[PDB]
Amino acid sequence: MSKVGINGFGRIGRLVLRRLLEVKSNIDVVAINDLTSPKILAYLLKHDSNYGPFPWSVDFTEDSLIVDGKSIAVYAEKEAKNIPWKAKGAEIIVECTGFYTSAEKSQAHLDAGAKKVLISAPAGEMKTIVYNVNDDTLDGNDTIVSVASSTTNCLAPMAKALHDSFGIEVGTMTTIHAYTGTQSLVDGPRGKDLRASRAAAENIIPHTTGAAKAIGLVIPELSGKLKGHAQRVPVKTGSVTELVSILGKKVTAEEVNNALKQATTNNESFGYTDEEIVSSDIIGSHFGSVFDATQTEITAVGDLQLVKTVAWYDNEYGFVTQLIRTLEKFAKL
Amino acid sequence: ASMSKVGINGFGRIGRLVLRRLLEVKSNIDVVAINDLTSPKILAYLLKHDSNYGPFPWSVDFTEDSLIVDGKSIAVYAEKEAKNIPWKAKGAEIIVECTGFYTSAEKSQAHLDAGAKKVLISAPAGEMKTIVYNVNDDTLDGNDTIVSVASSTTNCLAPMAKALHDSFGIEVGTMTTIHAYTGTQSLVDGPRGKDLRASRAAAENIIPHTTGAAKAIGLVIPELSGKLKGHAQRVPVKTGSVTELVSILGKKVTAEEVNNALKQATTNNESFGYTDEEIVSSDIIGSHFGSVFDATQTEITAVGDLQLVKTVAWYDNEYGFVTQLIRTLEKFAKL
Amino acid sequence: SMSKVGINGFGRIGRLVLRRLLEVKSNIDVVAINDLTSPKILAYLLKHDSNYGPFPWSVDFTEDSLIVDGKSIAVYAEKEAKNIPWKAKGAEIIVECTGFYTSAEKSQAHLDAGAKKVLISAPAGEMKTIVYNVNDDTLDGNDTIVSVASSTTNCLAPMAKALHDSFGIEVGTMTTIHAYTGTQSLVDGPRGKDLRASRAAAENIIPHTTGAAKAIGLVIPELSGKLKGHAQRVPVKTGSVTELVSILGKKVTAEEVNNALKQATTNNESFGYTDEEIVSSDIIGSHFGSVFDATQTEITAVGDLQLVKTVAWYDNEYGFVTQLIRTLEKFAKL
Amino acid sequence: MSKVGINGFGRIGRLVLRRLLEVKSNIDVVAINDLTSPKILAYLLKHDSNYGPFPWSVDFTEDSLIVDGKSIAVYAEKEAKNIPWKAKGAEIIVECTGFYTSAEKSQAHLDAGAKKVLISAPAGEMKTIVYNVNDDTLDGNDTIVSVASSTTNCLAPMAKALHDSFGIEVGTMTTIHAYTGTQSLVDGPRGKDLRASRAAAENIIPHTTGAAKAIGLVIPELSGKLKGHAQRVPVKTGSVTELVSILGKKVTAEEVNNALKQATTNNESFGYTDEEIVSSDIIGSHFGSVFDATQTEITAVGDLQLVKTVAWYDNEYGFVTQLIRTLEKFAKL
Ligand SMILES: NC(=O)c1ccc[n+]([C@@H]2O[C@H](COP(=O)([O-])OP(=O)(O)OC[C@H]3O[C@@H](n4cnc5c(N)ncnc54)[C@H](O)[C@@H]3O)[C@@H](O)[C@H]2O)c1
Ligand SMILES: NC(=O)c1ccc[n+]([C@@H]2O[C@H](COP(=O)([O-])OP(=O)(O)OC[C@H]3O[C@@H](n4cnc5c(N)ncnc54)[C@H](O)[C@@H]3O)[C@@H](O)[C@H]2O)c1
Ligand SMILES: NC(=O)c1ccc[n+]([C@@H]2O[C@H](COP(=O)([O-])OP(=O)(O)OC[C@H]3O[C@@H](n4cnc5c(N)ncnc54)[C@H](O)[C@@H]3O)[C@@H](O)[C@H]2O)c1
Ligand SMILES: NC(=O)c1ccc[n+]([C@@H]2O[C@H](COP(=O)([O-])OP(=O)(O)OC[C@H]3O[C@@H](n4cnc5c(N)ncnc54)[C@H](O)[C@@H]3O)[C@@H](O)[C@H]2O)c1
Ligand SMILES: [Cl-]
Ligand SMILES: [Cl-]
Ligand SMILES: [Cl-]
Ligand SMILES: [Cl-]
Ligand SMILES: [Cl-]
Ligand SMILES: [Cl-]
């Protein structure tokens, strides 16, 4: 299985192609569905506000892109059940619209002639994969799978490390998170989420995220043990996740840091830093998550101990590297 | 006292500030109905909490079908097609059309078919009477039913062009506005209609953008038809904009002479202000003028008998423009 | 009453101190300002504010003064506090807003220069430190140099106090998502010894040390040593939010925590309550030191192990200034 | 000459080193003078908010940087006359502090034992070079030269092409310009300039530039014929210069754009675009100026004609590519 279609050629959809080209994948993107013209999709692929010029040639015709000399069909079907995936034989759909985040909704792609769907987002109780945490759970009979959120890909490897080394008894997460297209440019209606209606680049905006709540899909032993939320802030990409835990063991900072470093050794998904980085330094990262030893904090009074651990993530490109790792493995089962 | 009943179509950046300003000046206009695409709950939230102008100055509550503002009920509708808005239910006769989707005489006709009497469009709307208050509001009369107040940029450019034309003659000119980003632009890089540049992250770029302000200035100042062009550079400020005009004038001038002429034009002028202070864009946020001429930026470049004159005016493209809209509304309502 | 004030450092805080004093028609008169610049530049900065808009009163200047709402304010430019000629106009209480005199040892220079008392707008070591309506009762007539701690302290303390009083705080850690300030950098470049502080403040999320939690014991003695925390500086111009994750001395529900907080904010000029879905720009211009936000309360529990997250907004500029002024007024009458 | 010293390892200073390494120059930076430690300089070189991680290894010792395995001395001398340029034999100083922008001030480097100085800014009445406009004016007797400002490097090539093809009779420019370190993060004193006191990331701020005023040093024929100024705005780097001119004959937009296309042909200093780019697309440009045919505008009323031409520039890196070009030539004379 080598032929892919992308539904939603947005921030994530376009970076999916960029990354596949970058790693010289044997996956072949044959079709793209969105809501617009090839002309506009070509413009957006070529010029990127966060990552700069597309490294390959880009042209278009009235119904296709031509990327690095290869033709990619472009469709504009707002209902996935109408996407003509069989025309170019798209077998695996990378589902990056935000409108099909359940097994029932993504079933449309299979009805439309595809064989498998990989959803770029949480999608309820289905196989949900953070690469290098639970990718071994992908199965030859899986047809619809989720890679959860960027935040999940940031939290999970840190949570796995901690839990494996020390035990996590309970914990709460706050991500300080780059603004995304689900937010608003100027104050205006944005469905039922009132906070989402507020000007994103001019505000700190509290936001609900399921990353902690649904972590049991990725690390079953942590089911129900974590909660958390996001503060959306005015940076264009690059985010940071803080986790405050009660661990099963008394620890030093050096001990937590040492365990995290071991977990990141030879781990292409999970990086380590002890440099005093800031968010722009994570832009373009090829990890899902980069644990930051410099922010580790142990607060102890008598017998009680809280442990704060912190990890960076490029919620666009870093997350995409994870999605592609998952896609490559998925495509072979 | 004329008590005209008003309806607002599009309770957006402009539509919400229209209400704010009407209450602020204690207008005799009664806003009796609002049409948008959402619930009273959401509109109440947006009216109360404003990222640019802070807490609404009056109480705001909602019911299942209304806003209650300072104790007065305003019916809320959600008809995406204007012909279906029940403007007759609360007697809304003048519609302040602020959706961006009815910017022509043919499209705003739907408000009249739905039972309103008059429409004031908060944007350019092609070949119709187009009013910059204190420039050409004298051209209004009792027979007008659908009128435009043009763009924020027009409201900035027109008083400055008028003053220059009246004092010196403008022979030809070009404008560039360095302009706050607005809701027509994009939060993240993504399709935004057919304008390629408008697809790009607005808070992260300088983005060239076309504006008709200079091209259609002739609707406002007929003598300058076809003598002006220009465009915008959209930049990452949330509101507050500035318009530069480079002109060949009908006579040789000094900067002092230009500045004095502009000062005279702003004296006892509620619409057009003047400054010789070294202000920046956040200083214009909340302006009660459609335009403020900035004498500190005046520049004369002269070689032999050739002269280029650069004149610069700030504007709050949100609230400042709204003050112009309301002045035109209060006049248009009484005719 | 002491009634004559000098401001040292007519900066974000110093200018807003004057604004607030005139807004509340205090009987305190500002008779002198010291900074490093000209009256022209101070008048320009006072008239024009990027965060709060035009100054609400008339502003003019001479070669050695400001004239504000028709009242003359002397302007000095002495970089060393000991040299400031405070006695010329009888400045009694110095509001110290430069950031350069954050200790009793440093700020006593003002006294050498002829002042009677100093109120420092920042943490200043282990001196008496006041969060209004948390421990301002500890002030007395013998206090000569006093601190009002940081904006973050003023946000954190009334929340911690309410929780501690109702339920007990056994241990906790704070993270404040905090507007950038003048201590940061516009473009990437050296900013003393702190590496992170060198980075472009409007283009990054920047981890940053704060003493608010560490030194909370100056303000709430029973929590001495029980809290730690830090900041993430982010690109908003003012308006900040503080999260505290606590182990409490009692099993609780979110409603119970929210009700206790609501009670503590009733008839409390310093400490507000909200259950509206606000964002940071809605706190800009707040007249509170701290606004507890019920919408963000979260209780995470497995058996007897319970974490409690509580969240309060604060306008680190003006809201903090309202606290500084409340303290100042009281300080002036002891 | 192949040994360079950098004074002011700032935005421009650090990028100078980056660009020298990128083009594999035979110039070697042997010393750097600034106001801080090697540790802080190394941190700053390594992690860049605008251009991302440094492409070569960077380490530090107590007295130096190690960059790509080579040692560069670090000094911290506030006054240029005390800088030990002779210790490592620094021959040409790239003067990037902003405090020595005159022949008389930059003499202190020669007094301290350097042989030449290239100033990264306008520096009064001395030879002022925009590469591929007037670098032919340099000779072997020059010892202190200027490469003018970012805006000068943007303006000059566009003015040269217009004036050569059509004649410029008079003109005024406005650059819509990224904020720089001369501005203020929060409202507060910043020298005598009132507008420079105001928070740069939250305002449009009118600001002087002498690029047009002193354009005569670069294009003597245009001396006294141009004025202009800037509007500093909240983007981190990437700028755009508009020039409104009265030309020496009647033109069409196509005529202007073809003349500009021809001037940019085989021109390493000066680029052309007819794509609908925005400021983030110029970040990391290897040109001093990129003329933009999409924004050309002719306003004609009988005999009277205004011509508006627009060119992008990366005021950091793009400018630095011009600085290095001039540097490489200056080193050989
Ligand atoms: N941006 C992030 O940080 C991030 C990170 C991880 C996951 N995700 C997830 O990926 C998905 C996409 O996010 P994004 O940031 O790329 O969003 P985006 O808005 O940039 O892109 C969505 C794309 O889908 C297209 N689209 C919308 N509705 C459609 C439909 N019915 N049919 C076809 N195309 C349609 C749009 O035109 C757009 O090009 C979401 O589920 C999101 O939660 C986003
Ligand atoms: N700077 C400014 O923002 C500014 C200045 C002057 C004029 N204008 C003009 O005013 C108009 C509104 O601009 P804005 O910035 O308030 O835009 P906006 O997007 O903030 O508001 C538009 C509002 O209209 C609603 N809407 C959209 N389609 C609708 C429909 N069919 N029926 C009912 N409601 C609908 C939206 O839900 C939203 O509340 C545009 O014509 C614009 O050009 C804007
Ligand atoms: N900005 C905030 O959010 C905030 C909140 C609470 C407390 N604080 C504290 O208040 C103090 C001031 O902060 P700010 O944000 O107003 O800083 P700022 O940089 O805006 O103001 C500093 C002022 O002091 C002047 N100054 C510097 N050194 C001086 C000296 N030796 N003598 C006289 N004047 C001098 C400067 O010129 C400037 O006007 C600091 O201690 C800071 O921690 C700041
Ligand atoms: N930033 C731009 O866009 C740009 C473009 C073209 C030219 N320039 C010019 O280049 C020069 C540098 O600008 P920049 O943006 O890199 O400024 P910067 O502020 O980023 O760097 C200045 C550097 O010099 C150091 N410094 C200050 N005084 C010093 C001294 N006396 N001795 C040694 N080091 C000292 C600082 O610590 C800092 O590292 C200026 O003259 C500027 O006009 C800047
Ligand atoms: Cl949760
Ligand atoms: Cl989130
Ligand atoms: Cl035009
Ligand atoms: Cl701490
Ligand atoms: Cl802080
Ligand atoms: Cl000039």
PDB file of N, CA, C and O in Angstrom, chain B residues 118-156:
ATOM      1  N   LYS B 118     -34.935  52.187   4.255  1.00  0.00           N
ATOM      2  CA  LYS B 118     -33.695  52.762   3.859  1.00  0.00           C
ATOM      3  C   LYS B 118     -32.571  51.839   4.289  1.00  0.00           C
ATOM      4  O   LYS B 118     -32.725  51.087   5.290  1.00  0.00           O
ATOM      5  N   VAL B 119     -31.461  51.898   3.550  1.00  0.00           N
ATOM      6  CA  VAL B 119     -30.238  51.130   3.875  1.00  0.00           C
ATOM      7  C   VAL B 119     -28.997  51.996   3.805  1.00  0.00           C
ATOM      8  O   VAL B 119     -28.835  52.762   2.885  1.00  0.00           O
ATOM      9  N   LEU B 120     -28.135  51.892   4.814  1.00  0.00           N
ATOM     10  CA  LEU B 120     -26.856  52.584   4.857  1.00  0.00           C
ATOM     11  C   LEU B 120     -25.812  51.497   4.910  1.00  0.00           C
ATOM     12  O   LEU B 120     -25.784  50.759   5.897  1.00  0.00           O
ATOM     13  N   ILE B 121     -25.007  51.378   3.855  1.00  0.00           N
ATOM     14  CA  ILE B 121     -24.059  50.264   3.696  1.00  0.00           C
ATOM     15  C   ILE B 121     -22.710  50.741   4.262  1.00  0.00           C
ATOM     16  O   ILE B 121     -22.173  51.782   3.806  1.00  0.00           O
ATOM     17  N   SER B 122     -22.135  49.938   5.173  1.00  0.00           N
ATOM     18  CA  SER B 122     -20.897  50.239   5.853  1.00  0.00           C
ATOM     19  C   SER B 122     -19.673  49.919   5.011  1.00  0.00           C
ATOM     20  O   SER B 122     -18.608  49.585   5.551  1.00  0.00           O
ATOM     21  N   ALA B 123     -19.786  50.042   3.701  1.00  0.00           N
ATOM     22  CA  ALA B 123     -18.708  49.733   2.818  1.00  0.00           C
ATOM     23  C   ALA B 123     -18.930  50.349   1.451  1.00  0.00           C
ATOM     24  O   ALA B 123     -20.060  50.716   1.139  1.00  0.00           O
ATOM     25  N   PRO B 124     -17.876  50.392   0.617  1.00  0.00           N
ATOM     26  CA  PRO B 124     -18.164  50.737  -0.820  1.00  0.00           C
ATOM     27  C   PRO B 124     -19.218  49.797  -1.423  1.00  0.00           C
ATOM     28  O   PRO B 124     -19.250  48.603  -1.128  1.00  0.00           O
ATOM     29  N   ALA B 125     -20.106  50.359  -2.219  1.00  0.00           N
ATOM     30  CA  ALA B 125     -21.200  49.577  -2.794  1.00  0.00           C
ATOM     31  C   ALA B 125     -21.486  49.991  -4.250  1.00  0.00           C
ATOM     32  O   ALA B 125     -22.688  50.137  -4.666  1.00  0.00           O
ATOM     33  N   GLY B 126     -20.385  50.203  -4.966  1.00  0.00           N
ATOM     34  CA  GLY B 126     -20.409  50.597  -6.363  1.00  0.00           C
ATOM     35  C   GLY B 126     -21.004  51.959  -6.567  1.00  0.00           C
ATOM     36  O   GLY B 126     -20.804  52.893  -5.756  1.00  0.00           O
ATOM     37  N   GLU B 127     -21.742  52.082  -7.680  1.00  0.00           N
ATOM     38  CA  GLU B 127     -22.194  53.371  -8.198  1.00  0.00           C
ATOM     39  C   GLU B 127     -23.458  53.816  -7.509  1.00  0.00           C
ATOM     40  O   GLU B 127     -24.572  53.677  -8.020  1.00  0.00           O
ATOM     41  N   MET B 128     -23.272  54.339  -6.313  1.00  0.00           N
ATOM     42  CA  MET B 128     -24.372  54.846  -5.539  1.00  0.00           C
ATOM     43  C   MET B 128     -23.813  55.990  -4.768  1.00  0.00           C
ATOM     44  O   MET B 128     -22.601  56.195  -4.716  1.00  0.00           O
ATOM     45  N   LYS B 129     -24.719  56.731  -4.192  1.00  0.00           N
ATOM     46  CA  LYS B 129     -24.357  57.864  -3.390  1.00  0.00           C
ATOM     47  C   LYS B 129     -23.488  57.299  -2.244  1.00  0.00           C
ATOM     48  O   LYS B 129     -23.853  56.297  -1.593  1.00  0.00           O
ATOM     49  N   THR B 130     -22.331  57.895  -2.097  1.00  0.00           N
ATOM     50  CA  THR B 130     -21.272  57.408  -1.206  1.00  0.00           C
ATOM     51  C   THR B 130     -20.772  58.621  -0.415  1.00  0.00           C
ATOM     52  O   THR B 130     -20.266  59.532  -0.998  1.00  0.00           O
ATOM     53  N   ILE B 131     -20.938  58.605   0.911  1.00  0.00           N
ATOM     54  CA  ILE B 131     -20.828  59.740   1.739  1.00  0.00           C
ATOM     55  C   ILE B 131     -19.689  59.614   2.747  1.00  0.00           C
ATOM     56  O   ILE B 131     -19.648  58.624   3.541  1.00  0.00           O
ATOM     57  N   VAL B 132     -18.794  60.607   2.698  1.00  0.00           N
ATOM     58  CA  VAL B 132     -17.860  60.838   3.777  1.00  0.00           C
ATOM     59  C   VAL B 132     -18.368  62.060   4.535  1.00  0.00           C
ATOM     60  O   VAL B 132     -18.285  63.202   4.031  1.00  0.00           O
ATOM     61  N   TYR B 133     -18.873  61.851   5.752  1.00  0.00           N
ATOM     62  CA  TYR B 133     -19.370  63.001   6.493  1.00  0.00           C
ATOM     63  C   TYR B 133     -18.360  64.140   6.628  1.00  0.00           C
ATOM     64  O   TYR B 133     -17.136  63.937   6.851  1.00  0.00           O
ATOM     65  N   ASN B 134     -18.904  65.352   6.469  1.00  0.00           N
ATOM     66  CA  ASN B 134     -18.158  66.612   6.396  1.00  0.00           C
ATOM     67  C   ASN B 134     -17.315  66.733   5.148  1.00  0.00           C
ATOM     68  O   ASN B 134     -16.536  67.645   5.058  1.00  0.00           O
ATOM     69  N   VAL B 135     -17.459  65.828   4.202  1.00  0.00           N
ATOM     70  CA  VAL B 135     -16.952  66.069   2.860  1.00  0.00           C
ATOM     71  C   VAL B 135     -18.082  66.319   1.880  1.00  0.00           C
ATOM     72  O   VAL B 135     -18.087  67.363   1.242  1.00  0.00           O
ATOM     73  N   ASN B 136     -19.026  65.400   1.770  1.00  0.00           N
ATOM     74  CA  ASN B 136     -20.083  65.497   0.775  1.00  0.00           C
ATOM     75  C   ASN B 136     -21.439  65.072   1.315  1.00  0.00           C
ATOM     76  O   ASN B 136     -22.295  64.644   0.574  1.00  0.00           O
ATOM     77  N   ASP B 137     -21.649  65.173   2.620  1.00  0.00           N
ATOM     78  CA  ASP B 137     -22.945  64.714   3.182  1.00  0.00           C
ATOM     79  C   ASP B 137     -24.100  65.656   2.789  1.00  0.00           C
ATOM     80  O   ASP B 137     -25.301  65.262   2.873  1.00  0.00           O
ATOM     81  N   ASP B 138     -23.749  66.882   2.362  1.00  0.00           N
ATOM     82  CA  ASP B 138     -24.714  67.781   1.699  1.00  0.00           C
ATOM     83  C   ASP B 138     -25.391  67.227   0.496  1.00  0.00           C
ATOM     84  O   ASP B 138     -26.391  67.769   0.097  1.00  0.00           O
ATOM     85  N   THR B 139     -24.797  66.249  -0.167  1.00  0.00           N
ATOM     86  CA  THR B 139     -25.416  65.628  -1.335  1.00  0.00           C
ATOM     87  C   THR B 139     -26.566  64.690  -1.033  1.00  0.00           C
ATOM     88  O   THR B 139     -27.195  64.205  -1.952  1.00  0.00           O
ATOM     89  N   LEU B 140     -26.815  64.386   0.222  1.00  0.00           N
ATOM     90  CA  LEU B 140     -27.943  63.529   0.574  1.00  0.00           C
ATOM     91  C   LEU B 140     -29.260  64.280   0.442  1.00  0.00           C
ATOM     92  O   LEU B 140     -29.295  65.481   0.658  1.00  0.00           O
ATOM     93  N   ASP B 141     -30.338  63.565   0.145  1.00  0.00           N
ATOM     94  CA  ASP B 141     -31.656  64.183   0.207  1.00  0.00           C
ATOM     95  C   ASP B 141     -32.747  63.182   0.522  1.00  0.00           C
ATOM     96  O   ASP B 141     -32.469  61.976   0.652  1.00  0.00           O
ATOM     97  N   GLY B 142     -33.969  63.698   0.691  1.00  0.00           N
ATOM     98  CA  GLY B 142     -35.137  62.899   1.009  1.00  0.00           C
ATOM     99  C   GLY B 142     -35.439  61.754   0.073  1.00  0.00           C
ATOM    100  O   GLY B 142     -36.150  60.841   0.477  1.00  0.00           O
ATOM    101  N   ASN B 143     -34.907  61.769  -1.154  1.00  0.00           N
ATOM    102  CA  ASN B 143     -35.165  60.692  -2.124  1.00  0.00           C
ATOM    103  C   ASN B 143     -34.243  59.488  -2.064  1.00  0.00           C
ATOM    104  O   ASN B 143     -34.575  58.420  -2.595  1.00  0.00           O
ATOM    105  N   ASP B 144     -33.120  59.627  -1.364  1.00  0.00           N
ATOM    106  CA  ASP B 144     -32.211  58.492  -1.175  1.00  0.00           C
ATOM    107  C   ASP B 144     -32.812  57.415  -0.281  1.00  0.00           C
ATOM    108  O   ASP B 144     -33.332  57.696   0.804  1.00  0.00           O
ATOM    109  N   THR B 145     -32.735  56.185  -0.737  1.00  0.00           N
ATOM    110  CA  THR B 145     -33.093  55.036   0.083  1.00  0.00           C
ATOM    111  C   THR B 145     -31.920  54.065   0.363  1.00  0.00           C
ATOM    112  O   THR B 145     -31.982  53.332   1.355  1.00  0.00           O
ATOM    113  N   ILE B 146     -30.919  54.008  -0.513  1.00  0.00           N
ATOM    114  CA  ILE B 146     -29.751  53.160  -0.292  1.00  0.00           C
ATOM    115  C   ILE B 146     -28.459  53.950  -0.582  1.00  0.00           C
ATOM    116  O   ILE B 146     -28.238  54.362  -1.698  1.00  0.00           O
ATOM    117  N   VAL B 147     -27.595  54.097   0.419  1.00  0.00           N
ATOM    118  CA  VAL B 147     -26.436  54.962   0.384  1.00  0.00           C
ATOM    119  C   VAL B 147     -25.290  54.172   1.008  1.00  0.00           C
ATOM    120  O   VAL B 147     -25.536  53.273   1.806  1.00  0.00           O
ATOM    121  N   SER B 148     -24.060  54.521   0.649  1.00  0.00           N
ATOM    122  CA  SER B 148     -22.818  53.937   1.175  1.00  0.00           C
ATOM    123  C   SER B 148     -22.065  54.979   1.933  1.00  0.00           C
ATOM    124  O   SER B 148     -22.147  56.197   1.615  1.00  0.00           O
ATOM    125  N   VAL B 149     -21.287  54.539   2.928  1.00  0.00           N
ATOM    126  CA  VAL B 149     -20.330  55.445   3.577  1.00  0.00           C
ATOM    127  C   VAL B 149     -18.899  55.065   3.223  1.00  0.00           C
ATOM    128  O   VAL B 149     -17.969  55.449   3.945  1.00  0.00           O
ATOM    129  N   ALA B 150     -18.728  54.327   2.130  1.00  0.00           N
ATOM    130  CA  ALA B 150     -17.448  53.883   1.672  1.00  0.00           C
ATOM    131  C   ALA B 150     -16.656  53.053   2.700  1.00  0.00           C
ATOM    132  O   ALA B 150     -17.240  52.359   3.460  1.00  0.00           O
ATOM    133  N   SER B 151     -15.328  53.029   2.576  1.00  0.00           N
ATOM    134  CA  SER B 151     -14.422  52.256   3.423  1.00  0.00           C
ATOM    135  C   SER B 151     -13.826  53.172   4.486  1.00  0.00           C
ATOM    136  O   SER B 151     -13.952  54.418   4.415  1.00  0.00           O
ATOM    137  N   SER B 152     -13.147  52.549   5.475  1.00  0.00           N
ATOM    138  CA  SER B 152     -12.377  53.324   6.461  1.00  0.00           C
ATOM    139  C   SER B 152     -11.339  54.184   5.730  1.00  0.00           C
ATOM    140  O   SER B 152     -11.156  55.377   6.010  1.00  0.00           O
ATOM    141  N   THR B 153     -10.650  53.559   4.781  1.00  0.00           N
ATOM    142  CA  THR B 153      -9.606  54.266   4.075  1.00  0.00           C
ATOM    143  C   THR B 153     -10.144  55.473   3.295  1.00  0.00           C
ATOM    144  O   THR B 153      -9.556  56.543   3.297  1.00  0.00           O
ATOM    145  N   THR B 154     -11.311  55.334   2.655  1.00  0.00           N
ATOM    146  CA  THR B 154     -11.923  56.496   2.021  1.00  0.00           C
ATOM    147  C   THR B 154     -12.205  57.644   2.982  1.00  0.00           C
ATOM    148  O   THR B 154     -11.966  58.815   2.648  1.00  0.00           O
ATOM    149  N   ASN B 155     -12.727  57.303   4.160  1.00  0.00           N
ATOM    150  CA  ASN B 155     -13.021  58.264   5.158  1.00  0.00           C
ATOM    151  C   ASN B 155     -11.760  58.941   5.669  1.00  0.00           C
ATOM    152  O   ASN B 155     -11.818  60.081   6.100  1.00  0.00           O
ATOM    153  N   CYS B 156     -10.631  58.250   5.625  1.00  0.00           N
ATOM    154  CA  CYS B 156      -9.372  58.881   5.918  1.00  0.00           C
ATOM    155  C   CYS B 156      -8.825  59.802   4.815  1.00  0.00           C
ATOM    156  O   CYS B 156      -8.440  60.977   5.039  1.00  0.00           O
TER     157      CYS B 156
END
